[PDB]
Design a binder for this molecule. Structure first.
Ligand SMILES: *[C@H]1C(C#N)=C(O)C(C)(C)[C@@H]2CC[C@]3(C)C(=CC(=O)[C@@H]4[C@@H]5CC(C)(C)CC[C@]5(C(=O)O)CC[C@]43C)[C@@]12C
Ligand SMILES: *[C@H]1C(C#N)=C(O)C(C)(C)[C@@H]2CC[C@]3(C)C(=CC(=O)[C@@H]4[C@@H]5CC(C)(C)CC[C@]5(C(=O)O)CC[C@]43C)[C@@]12C
Lengths: 132, 132
């Protein structure tokens, strides 16, 4: 006689916590980012293409390429330092990003490169506050 | 001289919206649930193992099986009606579930089967309210 409709607000926060745990456990991962910047030593980041796609229109375009790979893809990344890539992956998984004030510019450059619009705004607003 | 730390509250809600769009687009999917219940016609649900794993300890256990499949897995499901499975998948992707009051019991049974604790609580509390 009625339509019972439930909603849990905390769900998306809760699921992303499990998603991040799975990432750190290197479980259910389907992409390895291979980050090589200048003289910096090479770094690998394991991740889920969906989670990266859900936070970045650049990763979404990269991974939604009509037909699907049979499992693990290595994506060669250049132009971002491994430490920057690390922070942007962590943002995608946690909704949080952290950096020292001297590298807000370099995190912004990475966020522009991966079209992570919210952290571009955050970084540009922070840099503008550091002015008279 | 300082630690700049940004956080976007809306991110997890925003990403799940993209995740659900990708599901309906049948993009980046790595599992097909093949649901056969009693006399009901067979149904297929495309999904992302991570998203199902992040919302269900039963799917998490199912998919975190030490070693990974090369792409698309078909999972044969029995004991839940396709309409129940549909609602529980949609919950995992949207944080929302909807049913008519006569089938709160059958949705609960599905949610117990997949250990989706929040909707078990919702359903059990609703059934208990329908009493004197
Ligand atoms: C600066 C910093 C602080 N405080 C950080 O929190 C992170 C985000 C971890 C930065 C990572 C990138 C890195 C290593 C960096 C500082 C830094 O000086 C280098 C450096 C900057 C210049 C010289 C402009 C280009 C090269 C280089 C590098 O060393 O390769 C790029 C990366 C960057 C910005 C932080 C440690
Ligand atoms: C009842 C309903 C309402 N109102 C719903 O919103 C959903 C959740 C869509 C239900 C899906 C499952 C289904 C088809 C159902 C009603 C119903 O009577 C059947 C039926 C119940 C019994 C007879 C107890 C067992 C068999 C059966 C079936 O038809 O296979 C199981 C599924 C169920 C509960 C809703 C339409």
């Amino acid at each position: 006689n009625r339509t019972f409709s439930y909603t849990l607000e905390d769900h998306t926060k809760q699921a992303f916590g499990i998603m991040n745990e799975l990432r750190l456990s290197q479980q259910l991962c389907d992409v390895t980012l291979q980050v090589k910047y200048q003289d910096a030593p090479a770094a690998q980041f394991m991740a889920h293409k969906v989670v990266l796609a859900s936070s970045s229109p650049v990763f979404k375009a990269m991974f939604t390429n009509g037909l699907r790979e049979q499992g693990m893809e290595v994506v060669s990344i250049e132009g971002i330092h491994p430490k920057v890539m690390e922070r942007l992956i962590e943002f995608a998984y946690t909704a949080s990003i952290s950096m020292g004030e001297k590298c807000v510019l370099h995190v912004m450059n990475g966020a522009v490169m991966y079209q992570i619009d919210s952290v571009v705004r955050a970084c540009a607003d922070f840099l503008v506050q550091q002015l008279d």
